[PDB]
Amino acid sequence: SPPVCGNKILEQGEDCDCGSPANCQDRCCNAATCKLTPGSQCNYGECCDQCRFKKAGTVCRIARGDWNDDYCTGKSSDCPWNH
């Protein structure tokens, strides 16, 4: 699944796109923008939860025990170990 904006593949650095703006069957992902539609923050990823990123502080990972603890940032679908 290469990076094609307008192919229904969230690969073309879109983070939310549909094959065709007219057939965009993703209320959370818009092709015309190749990004999360207005109102949604997530769509795919660890931080993604209900088309909305997990409020910063939501533990989603762990390095190797419990020091810094991996926590969401409520800004992306990624969860940094916090290291």
Q: Where are the domains of the chain?
A: 1-83
CA–CA distances in Å: residue 9 to residues 2, 27, 56, 83: 8, 15, 27, 31
Residue 45: how many CB atoms within 10 A of its CB? 17
Tokens of 8: 């229904």
Tell me phi and psi for residue 22, to 5 degrees.
-85, -30
Residues closing a segment before a gap in the chain (C–N exceeding 2.5 Å): none
Amino acid 2 reads P
User: Token match 């949604």: residue?
Assistant: 40
Q: What's the distance, CA 46 to chain centroid?
A: 8
In the CATH hierarchy, which top-level class contains the domain 1-83? few secondary structures
CA–CA distances in Å: residue 14 to residues 48, 69, 74, 80: 15, 28, 18, 21
9's CB contacts (< 8 A; 6+ apart) are: 1, 2, 3, 17
The 3-state DSSP class for residue 5 equals coil
End-to-end CA gap in the chain: 31
